[PDB]
Amino acid sequence: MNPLTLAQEIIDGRRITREDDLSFFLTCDLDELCEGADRIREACIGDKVDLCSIINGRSGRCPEDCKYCAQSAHHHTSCEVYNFLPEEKILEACKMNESEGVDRFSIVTAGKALTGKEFDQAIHAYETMHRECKIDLCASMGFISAEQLHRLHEAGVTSYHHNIETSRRNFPNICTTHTYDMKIETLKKVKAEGMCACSGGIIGMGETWEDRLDMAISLAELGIDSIPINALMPIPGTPLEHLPELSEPDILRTIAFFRYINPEANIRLAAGRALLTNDGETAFKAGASASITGNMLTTVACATIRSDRKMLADMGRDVTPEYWKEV
Ligand SMILES: C[S@+](CC[C@H](N)C(=O)[O-])C[C@H]1O[C@@H](n2cnc3c(N)ncnc32)[C@H](O)[C@@H]1O
Ligand SMILES: C[C@@H]1NC(=O)N[C@@H]1CCCCCC(=O)O
Ligand code: SF4
Ligand SMILES: [Cl-]
Ligand SMILES: [Fe+3]
């Protein structure tokens, strides 16, 4: 077995399982694994690169203890602190991302879960966006209930984001206040609601190569539709502030095997894209088919949205959103 023929087999319908020799993806040649991942992406996704965007709808004060997170109240960081934003600020950002041609937009909230009056405020914001704007809609709100997921879906939200973060084995080393099992339960609810599930995690936090493979396999078993691969941005004041940043070859290997293991998913670049040369150009040629663009939650964009769209179009990818296709 070799990466080039294995990519052909997957194009022709083979699917990697937990019982396959996953160590192959660690020992095989990187450039061949990238080439094969790009071919799998071309066959299963095609040339569209889906671009999404986010707003930090509620910043800081989270009681959870995730070791990477700027917004955990267990850490003293530079993060802004505010309760759920006024609707006008959300609509301003939605309209801006639509003016720039982004495919979808998400409200992302710090906290264990968004509940009660602030949840109602989010719903109202989605109703206004669904009425006024053509850009598609996502939410990332923590451990919400099935009834809340249905309310989001009825208001026009089509994807729910809930990252597994790390492998099951490594999860207790990153967070003690909630569990990996709790993440999987939310994801099952997202699928039962008929929404797209967007779930990935963070690499470079000290997890092993085998943990990264287990993340990829676990998301494949769930049928996850969109998989954000964040490289750690070490945040000053958090426990992980002094971890070394990942190299481009290590990120590319990860993107590529996530593509082999999740051939039909959008493998999506997310935080840490500045670690890649040319703001991720090579990753789009190594299995990635989607990216978050523009500003993140407490850190700034690696480039403007326009720069990302021009880079992708110049390499021959399609970045025209559906709402700009008039005829
Ligand atoms: C989506 S959560 C917000 C909603 C909710 N509180 C939750 O945890 O599901 C924000 C996402 O940002 C990513 N993230 C946070 N801090 C990061 C960092 N320093 N480097 C890379 N990714 C990070 C994590 O993967 C996390 O899932
Ligand atoms: C929510 C978006 N979806 C995802 O998987 N990561 C994004 C957020 C990245 C945050 C990077 C660190 C920060 O800005 O605090
Ligand atoms: S639950 Fe979400 S906001 Fe809270 S510390 Fe963890 S990643 Fe950050
Ligand atoms: Cl756990
Ligand atoms: Fe603490």
CATH number at residue 105: 3.20.20.70
Count CB-CB contacts under 10 A for residue 305: 20
Report which of 169, 167, 161 is spatially closest to residue 144, judged by C-alpha positions.
161
Span between the terminal Cα atoms of the chain, in Å:
46
137 near 157, Cβ under 8 Å? yes
Given ligand 2 and candidates 140, 141, 266, 302, which is best to mutate, with the most ligand atoms within 8 Å of its CB?
140
3-state secondary structure of 213: helix
Query: Strands (DSSP E) along 88-209, which ranges?
Result: 104-109, 136-140, 159-161, 196-198, 201-203
Instruction: Look at residue 209 and tell me if it is in a domain.
Output: yes
Instruction: Look at residue 15 and tell me if it is in a domain.
Output: no
Report which of 294, 262, 240, 250 is spatially closest to residue 30, judged by C-alpha positions.
250
**Distance separating alpha carbons of residues 101 and 117, to the nearest angstrom:** 32
**Distance separating alpha carbons of residues 189 and 187, to the nearest angstrom:** 5
Helices 146-155/116-132 angle, 10° precision: 20
**Distance separating alpha carbons of residues 164 and 232, to the nearest angstrom:** 14
DSSP letters, 239-280, are TTTTSPPPPHHHHHHHHHHHHHHSTTSEEEEBTBGGGSGGGG
108 near 163, Cβ under 8 Å? no
Residues with CB under 5 A from ligand 4 (ion): 171-172, 179-180
213 near 20, Cβ under 8 Å? no
Angle subtended at Cα 126 by Cα 124 and Cα 62, rounded to the nearest 5 degrees: 85
Strands 196-198 and 159-161: parallel
Q: Closest ligand to 64 CA?
A: 3
Instruction: Look at residue 1 and tell me if it is in a domain.
Output: no
The first and second tokens of residue 285, run together, are 């040629």
Q: Which residues belong to the annotated binding site for [4Fe-4S] cluster? A: 62, 66, 69
Ligand 1 and 202: CB distance under 6 A = yes
Count CB-CB contacts under 10 A for residue 289: 26
- DSSP designation for 85: P
Give, for 308, the enclosing helix (H) or strand (E): helix 305-314
Residue 110's Cβ-count burial label (10 Å; 0-12, 13-18, 19+) is: buried
Using alpha carbons, list the distances in angstroms from residue 288 to 12, 159, 172, 205.
19, 19, 29, 21
205 near 168, Cβ under 8 Å? no
Ligand 2 and 161: CB distance under 6 A = yes
Name the residue at shortest CA distance from atom 3 of ligand 3.
110
**Distance separating alpha carbons of residues 255 and 286, to the nearest angstrom:** 7
Report which of 82, 47, 48 is spatially closest to residue 62, judged by C-alpha positions.
82
Instruction: Look at residue 20 and tell me if it is in a domain.
Output: no
Instruction: Look at residue 178 and tell me if it is in a domain.
Output: yes
Ligand 2 atom at shortest distance from the alpha carbon of 79: 15
Q: Which residues contact 36 (CB under 8 A, 6 or more apart)?
A: 3, 4, 6, 7, 8, 256, 260
Instruction: Look at residue 181 and tell me if it is in a domain.
Output: yes
Range list of H helices, 133-179? 146-155
The first and second tokens of residue 292, run together, are 């978050």
Print the domain residue range for 197. Answer: 32-316
How many domains does the chain fold into? 1
Write down the residue that tokens 């910043």 correspond to. 59
Name the residue at shortest CA distance from atom 1 of ligand 2.
108
Report which of 100, 161, 152, 96 is spatially closest to residue 124, judged by C-alpha positions.
152
Name the residue at shortest CA distance from atom 8 of ligand 1.
142
243 near 234, Cβ under 8 Å? yes
Q: Which residues belong to the annotated binding site? A: 62, 66, 68-69, 74, 106, 138, 163, 165, 198, 233, 268
Ligand 1 and 163: CB distance under 6 A = yes
Angle subtended at Cα 149 by Cα 59 and Cα 52, rounded to the nearest 5 degrees: 55
DSSP letters, 22-43, are TTHHHHS-HHHHHHHHHHHHHH
The first and second tokens of residue 58, run together, are 């509620």
The first and second tokens of residue 274, run together, are 């500045």
Instruction: Look at residue 10 and tell me if it is in a domain.
Output: no
Ligand 2 atom at shortest distance from the alpha carbon of 233: 12
Report which of 74, 67, 60 is spatially closest to residue 242, judged by C-alpha positions.
67
Residue 285's Cβ-count burial label (10 Å; 0-12, 13-18, 19+) is: middle
Report which of 198, 171, 174, 196 is spatially closest to residue 182, judged by C-alpha positions.
171
Q: Report, in angstroms and rounded to the nearest whole number, the Rg of the chain calculated over CA atoms.
A: 19
**Distance separating alpha carbons of residues 274 and 148, to the nearest angstrom:** 35
Query: Strands (DSSP E) along the chain, which ranges?
Result: 50-58, 104-109, 136-140, 159-161, 196-198, 201-203, 226-231, 266-269, 290-292
| CA contacts within 13 A on the Cβ side of 254 | 27
Pocket of ligand 3 (CB under 6 A): 62, 64, 66, 69, 71-72, 110, 142
Instruction: Look at residue 89 and tell me if it is in a domain.
Output: yes
